[PDB]
Every structure is written in C-alpha cells, then in structure tokens.
RNA sequence: GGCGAGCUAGCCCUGGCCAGGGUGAAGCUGGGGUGAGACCCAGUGGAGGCCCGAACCGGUGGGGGAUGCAAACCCCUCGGA
RNA sequence: UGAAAUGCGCAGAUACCGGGAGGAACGCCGAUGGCGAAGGCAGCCACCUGGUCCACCCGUGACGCUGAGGCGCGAAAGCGUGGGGAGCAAACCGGAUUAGAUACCCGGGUAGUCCACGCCCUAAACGAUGCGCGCUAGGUCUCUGGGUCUCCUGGGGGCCGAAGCUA
RNA sequence: UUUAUGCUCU
C-alpha cells in the first residue's frame, strides 16, 4: 500500500505552499498515485473487476478536478498535467 | 477363531433397517446380525421390535465365543437405536459405555434430491 | 501462445504455429556437445519395417544428457534455451563451472542464467536432477530412469511429467504421464518439474505438406485397398469392416491387449 | 535353383533447376484511441502446398495417325509451375 | 418403499477396523447479522486491492446533481479449447405406480456441476419501489463508530407507528 | 400408495 510518508512526500511535493493539504494539484497528484498504483495491480489481478470499479470512481474524480482547474486556471493545467503525465 | 471376553459393540441404524456387529478388542468382527437375519424381509426390519430381536441374536453369538462386556456404539438416527441399546443391556453383556458416533459432513458431498429438500 | 494466421490461402486459415519467445539465442546449434549427423533411414536392413515415413527437412542430431549423476555436486548456469527438431520439448544449454558443456531437456520455468546442480545434495527446485529416493513425496518430475543408472526414459515429452505419489521399500511410486501407477527404483535419477513447451499439443499443421516436412508420407486405409493387401481391401463401393477391424497383418485393432502378459515387468506396475 | 530396380515404384547420400509480372499476411514505425488497453488509420514491409505465365513437370478435349514418324507419335487445346 | 421390485451379495456383499487415492463443499460459530452498485460474497493463512464509517474542524473554495449515446460488470443454464470428474444429475435404461405414466416414487446413469482461458448478456437480475438534496411526531429491537462512557451523538439493518399519502 | 372427468344457451 501507499505507505504515509510515501503519500507525504507527494503532499509537500505538489503543496502550492507550505501548509497546502488539499487544494485542486494536491488531490490531483494524490488520485494520480492510488490510480497508477491499481493501474498496475489490475494488470495482474485482472479478473478483479470490483477493485477496478473503484479505478473508474478515482479516475472520473480526477478529470472533475482537473476540469474545473483547466477552466479556472488553464496554465497551472498544463503544469499540472506535464509534472504528472496525464491526458493522452 | 478365538474366545475374547473384552469386546465391543456396533448399532448401525437407518430408516430401513439396524444391524449390529460385535467386534474384537481391536474392532474385527466377531459374530454380526441385523433385522433380515431375525427373519423379517420388506419395511419390517425398519421396526424398533426387529432392532430388539436382532440386538439379541447379536450378543447371545457373541456368549458363545465368550462374550462378557462391550463398548455399544450407534451410528445413525432411526427406530432401531434405543431398542437395540437396551436389548443389549437386558441380557448377559454388561454396557461398559454408550458413544453415538454416527457421522455427519461439516458440509461435503452434495446429497441425493430426497436428502436435500431445502436451500 | 500459438501463432494465427490470417487466411490469405486456406490451409493458412488453419495453420498454427508454435511460439519461440522462449527461444533464446539458438539459430545455430552447439558444434561439440552435439550435434552428431543423424543417419534419416526409414527402413531397417532392406526392408520397410515402419509404413509411411521418408522425407522431411533434413537434420542435425543434438547428443542431450539423460543421465546427470554424471556430474554429481557440480552446478552449472543455464546458457540458453535451444530448439531441437529431434523432439516435441525443447532443450537447454547448459555450461558447467567445469567448463563443460551438456544440453538437458528444458523443464517448465527454467529460465535462462540460473543455477543447475545434481546429486543427493541438490535444492528441491527446478531443473536439478536428484535420485528419487530423496525427493519430496508429491513434487512433480521429468525425465526419470526406469532403472538406476540406465538413463532417463519417462516424461520427456514436451508438457510431460510424472508424481511421486509414495514410497515402498526401495522402490518410490510414480504416477506415469500416461496415468499409470508404476514402482521405480528409489535410486533412479529424476529431475523437479514438468517438461515444459505444453502448448506443443495444440497446434495444427494446416496442411498435407507440413506433415510432410516432418517425415511422415501420406497413410492409406485398409478400406482403400485390395482384399491382397488388407482385411479390409475389396467390396465393390465403400464397405463396412465386414468383420472384426484388423490391421494389414491380420490382428484386430480394436480392444485387443498386446501387452506380454508373463512379464518380469509386471509385478511392479498397477494402472491403466 | 539362380538372373534382374541401367524401365518402373519408394526410400537413403550428394548436387542442380524454377523468365517475367501480379496480390500485399504478419511484424515494424508513426498517428489517433484509452485510466491503461483492445483497437482504428497510414506508411513500411514482403508472407503464401496465393494469382497470371515461359523454361521445366504434365496429359484435359478434339482432330490426325492405325502394315504409323512412332509396339503411346503429331497438331490444336488444356493442368501445375 | 406406502408396500415393493429392479439392483448388489456365498466369485465373501452389508456391518467393523487399518492403510491409500481422488474430487467437491465448508458443520458448530450463524443471527430475524455483516459486506457489495448489482449479479453476489461464508473453514484457515498470507500477499495484492475496492468501497465505507467515525473523531478532529486542519486544506481546496461550488470544483455540484443527473445523465440520451459510449464503456465496464452481470446468478444459473448454455458454447469453444484444454484439463478435472468423488458426490450429484437433464438426456437415456431399467423397476414400480396407472386406463396410459415419455411423470410423480425406486435402482442405474451421460453432458453438466469443478479449474484455466475466451464467449454468451438472460432472470420473479424483486423492496416487482431510478438517482441526488431539503423538509415533516415518536416507541422499541439490532449491527458498528465517537462520547465528559445510566445517557448522548453518527452511519447502517428490522418491527410498530404522528401528520400526510393510498382504490 | 388408485384416479380422471362433468355438452350448449339462461
Ligand atoms: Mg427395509
Ligand atoms: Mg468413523
Ligand atoms: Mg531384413
Ligand atoms: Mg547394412
Ligand atoms: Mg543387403
Ligand atoms: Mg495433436
Ligand atoms: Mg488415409
Ligand atoms: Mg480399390
Ligand atoms: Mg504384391
Ligand atoms: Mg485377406
Ligand atoms: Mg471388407
Ligand atoms: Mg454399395
Ligand atoms: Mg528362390
Ligand atoms: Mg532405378
Ligand atoms: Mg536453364
Ligand atoms: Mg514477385
Ligand atoms: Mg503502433
Ligand atoms: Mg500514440
Ligand atoms: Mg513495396
Ligand atoms: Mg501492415
Ligand atoms: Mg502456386
Ligand atoms: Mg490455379
Ligand atoms: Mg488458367
Ligand atoms: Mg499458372
Ligand atoms: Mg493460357
Ligand atoms: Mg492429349
Ligand atoms: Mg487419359
Ligand atoms: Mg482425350
Ligand atoms: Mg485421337
Ligand atoms: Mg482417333
Ligand atoms: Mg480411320
Ligand atoms: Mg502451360
Ligand atoms: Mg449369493
Ligand atoms: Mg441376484
Ligand atoms: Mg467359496
Ligand atoms: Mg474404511
Ligand atoms: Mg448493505
Ligand atoms: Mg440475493
Ligand atoms: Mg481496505
Ligand atoms: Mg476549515
Ligand atoms: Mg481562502
Ligand atoms: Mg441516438
Ligand atoms: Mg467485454
Ligand atoms: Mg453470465
Ligand atoms: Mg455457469
Ligand atoms: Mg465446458
Ligand atoms: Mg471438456
Ligand atoms: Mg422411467
Ligand atoms: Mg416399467
Ligand atoms: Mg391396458
Ligand atoms: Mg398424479
Ligand atoms: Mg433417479
Ligand atoms: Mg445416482
Ligand atoms: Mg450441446
Ligand atoms: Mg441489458
Ligand atoms: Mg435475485
Ligand atoms: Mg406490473
Ligand atoms: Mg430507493
Ligand atoms: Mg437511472
Ligand atoms: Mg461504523
Ligand atoms: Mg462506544
Ligand atoms: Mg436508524
Ligand atoms: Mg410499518
Ligand atoms: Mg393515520
Ligand atoms: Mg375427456
Ligand atoms: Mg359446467
Ligand atoms: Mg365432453
Ligand atoms: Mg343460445
């Protein structure tokens, strides 16, 4: 699992200041850890469709925000996206 | 084959019918009966009266090789159970002990339709 | 896997092939440890004693170890696995701290760069060869010596293998690939796991010419021919058996038992 | 009891041969696509008891030949290539 | 079995003991309980992993709700390729019953039931009750959190019920 | 453990 200072390390990292414990990157950056992480455990537990519904639900969440950010700030999206590697 | 005194006892009851072996020490059959070997054939052998009977041809087969106490064990419900129990008892062989061991799956085989009913 | 074809021919549309990704570096063999020519006859002193067989793509002969206690205590590292046309698994290359270099049959899972070693010793994992007296009863197993110091004779077969299913005296109780229940010799040589290339059993040869690249020459029916050649020759338009299916010299092939029955062999056997 | 596979059949060892054109499988690369995929589109590629057709191997239909050129041929046509 | 018959058995059966093989399902706990969106999930252990609730009032600052298409999941049966096959059991055979009995009862029994992979997309797939949010008495039983641990508070699962709704 | 069935319109 992701372990808590394993997770910590990706809070401070995206944190838009010190202090910063969920703002829009933060939870972002946050989906885009636990989604890579069942990305690659459904590659092998693939006939685990329930723990993939879930992925679905983290990955639906995860465009919202990023909807939301690209419309309030469409240059902290590019950020975002390419420190991330997301939308292809 | 031989004459032990020490013995022991086996009800075997089903709807049908009971029958009972009388082993050695060790289990090796001694002398065997069952209620067709009284001289029922059909339904009459499921009777508790056909237990008694059969018990009883049981044990006194089990005197003449020298038969004196028994360990009596049941296995499976029935009418032939406690007849079959107490006809032992009423009758030379003194019943050291009583163990119902009649076996039960902690959920094995699927059973038959008839045995199975609900869900 | 198995390879597929699109069909741009028929035949092609039915066509499987087996994978090679397995195959690591073979193309050309190992020119001393193997290969010897191999002497393509299909007929012994004069006569054809075998119907049916001739052509084929020609071939060299890969000399492999079946009998490992050859080199007891000596581990070796797995080199590559290797194609061999000679039979249905495919084989390892394996080089010895030694210097010397033998090809074993590859067992399921043996992957190229790890360590191989055989003897009484010898960890109860995959690719080492151990008498069988001293392997875990349950443990599947492959290429086992019928008889000690004979050589390896059972489970070589690509997917095949054989359990240990017991132990009696010196004897230890396999379970054959063909199901039979057999004793063998405790002291018999055998080594941990199934032999691997299993989806061997399932390709097809798609055509009539692919048969015949592997030597096989076309097979006619008794049904086909003359009451001169075959139980079943004559009739005058098809024909059922019209009598007990035989084979071209006579005995029927339907049932009858062919086994020897007075046989030292059998009092050491018990399945089908 | 011998003689025969210098014809013919099969097989074994070692060599050789198959003009030219057509179709364009996989794979590869790139692009789109997705959470990641399947997959789709291009281009590349050059597979096949694949296509057309000489050599070569055949022998389908017809005509001719019938004390023949010939104890199995010739012409036209056709099959594989 | 209603009673029987077929069936098995003096070629040594049933009953009993010891050894071995093999498959499937997990008794008590167990609940009128728990989990999941649904289908559905029940011996034990470990690894990987989804959802969900509570306390704190710490961060973002409407970033929400629903959702035609699309995509995914979807009991049982069924299908393809392999395997596996103990018990059970469509079909099928036999014994009974009956006017007949292609059924009901009995003795056999093959697909299937099991595993891998790939299809099928159905259902009384039922609470026959789409999802989200606010508002409108309470009583009692229960599961599970927090509490200044008689009581209070939050989320679930049941019954009885104010107001109202309803043919 | 043996039963099945009851013509048409009022
Ligand atoms: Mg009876
Ligand atoms: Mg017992
Ligand atoms: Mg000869
Ligand atoms: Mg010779
Ligand atoms: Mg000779
Ligand atoms: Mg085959
Ligand atoms: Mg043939
Ligand atoms: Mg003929
Ligand atoms: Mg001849
Ligand atoms: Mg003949
Ligand atoms: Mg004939
Ligand atoms: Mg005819
Ligand atoms: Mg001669
Ligand atoms: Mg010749
Ligand atoms: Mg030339
Ligand atoms: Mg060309
Ligand atoms: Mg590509
Ligand atoms: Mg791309
Ligand atoms: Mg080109
Ligand atoms: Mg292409
Ligand atoms: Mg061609
Ligand atoms: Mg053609
Ligand atoms: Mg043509
Ligand atoms: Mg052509
Ligand atoms: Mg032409
Ligand atoms: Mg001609
Ligand atoms: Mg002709
Ligand atoms: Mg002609
Ligand atoms: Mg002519
Ligand atoms: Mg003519
Ligand atoms: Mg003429
Ligand atoms: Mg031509
Ligand atoms: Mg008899
Ligand atoms: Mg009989
Ligand atoms: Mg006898
Ligand atoms: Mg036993
Ligand atoms: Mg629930
Ligand atoms: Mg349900
Ligand atoms: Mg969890
Ligand atoms: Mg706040
Ligand atoms: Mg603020
Ligand atoms: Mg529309
Ligand atoms: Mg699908
Ligand atoms: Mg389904
Ligand atoms: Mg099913
Ligand atoms: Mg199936
Ligand atoms: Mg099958
Ligand atoms: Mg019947
Ligand atoms: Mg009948
Ligand atoms: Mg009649
Ligand atoms: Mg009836
Ligand atoms: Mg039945
Ligand atoms: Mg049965
Ligand atoms: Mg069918
Ligand atoms: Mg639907
Ligand atoms: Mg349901
Ligand atoms: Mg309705
Ligand atoms: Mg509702
Ligand atoms: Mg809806
Ligand atoms: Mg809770
Ligand atoms: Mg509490
Ligand atoms: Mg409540
Ligand atoms: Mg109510
Ligand atoms: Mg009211
Ligand atoms: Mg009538
Ligand atoms: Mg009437
Ligand atoms: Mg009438
Ligand atoms: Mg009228």
């Given at each position: 699992p992701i372990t808590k200072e394993e997770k910590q390390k990706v809070i401070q990292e995206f944190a838009r200041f010190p202090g910063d414990t969920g703002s829009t990157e933060v939870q972002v950056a946050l989906l885009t850890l636990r989604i890579n992480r069942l990305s690659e455990h459904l590659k092998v537990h693939?006939?685990?469709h329930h723990s993939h519904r879930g992925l679905l639900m983290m990955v639906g969440q995860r465009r919202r925000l990023l909807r939301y950010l690209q419309r309030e700030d469409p240059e902290r999206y590019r950020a975002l996206i390419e420190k991330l590697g997301i939308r292809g | 084959k031989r004459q032990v005194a020490s013995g022991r006892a086996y009800i075997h009851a089903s709807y049908n019918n009971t029958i009972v072996t009388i082993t050695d020490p060790?289990?090796?059959?001694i002398t065997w009966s069952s209620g067709g070997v009284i001289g029922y054939k059909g339904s009459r052998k499921g009777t508790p009266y056909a237990a008694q009977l059969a018990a009883l041809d049981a044990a006194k087969k089990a005197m003449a090789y020298g038969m004196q106490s028994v360990d009596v064990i049941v296995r499976g419900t029935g009418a032939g159970r406690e007849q079959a129990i107490r006809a032992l008892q009423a009758s030379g062989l003194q019943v050291k002990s009583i163990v119902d061991d009649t076996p039960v799956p902690h959920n094995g085989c699927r059973p038959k339709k008839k045995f199975r009913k609900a869900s | 896997a198995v390879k597929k074809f699109k069909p741009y021919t028929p035949s092609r549309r039915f066509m499987t092939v087996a994978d090679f990704s397995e195959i690591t570096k073979t193309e050309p063999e190992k020119s001393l440890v193997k290969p010897l020519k191999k002497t393509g006859g299909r007929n012994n002193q004069g006569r054809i004693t075998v119907r049916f067989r001739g052509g084929g793509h020609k071939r060299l002969y890969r000399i492999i170890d079946f009998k490992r206690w050859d080199k007891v205590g000596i581990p070796a590292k797995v080199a590559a696995i290797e194609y061999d046309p000679n039979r249905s698994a495919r084989i390892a290359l394996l080089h010895y701290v030694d210097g010397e270099k033998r090809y074993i049959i590859a067992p399921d899972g043996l992957q190229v760069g790890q360590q191989v070693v055989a003897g009484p010793d010898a960890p109860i994992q995959v690719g080492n060869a151990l008498p069988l007296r001293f392997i875990p009863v349950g443990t599947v197993v492959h290429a086992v010596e019928l008889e000690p110091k004979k050589g390896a004779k059972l489970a070589?077969?690509?997917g095949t293998s054989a359990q240990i299913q017991g132990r009696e005296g010196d004897y230890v109780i396999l379970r054959l690939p063909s199901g039979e229940l057999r004793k063998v010799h405790g002291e018999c040589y055998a080594t941990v796991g199934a032999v691997g290339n299993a989806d061997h059993k399932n390709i097809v040869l798609g055509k009539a010419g692919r048969s015949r690249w592997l030597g096989r020459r076309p097979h006619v029916r008794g049904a086909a021919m003359n009451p001169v050649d075959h139980p079943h020759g004559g009739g005058e338009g098809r024909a059922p058996r019209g009598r007990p299916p035989a084979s071209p010299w006579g005995?029927?092939?339907?049932?009858l038992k062919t086994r020897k029955r007075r046989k030292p062999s059998s009092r050491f056997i018990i399945a089908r």
């Open positions: 693939k006939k685990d | 060790d289990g090796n059959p | 070589r077969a690509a005995w029927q092939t339907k049932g």
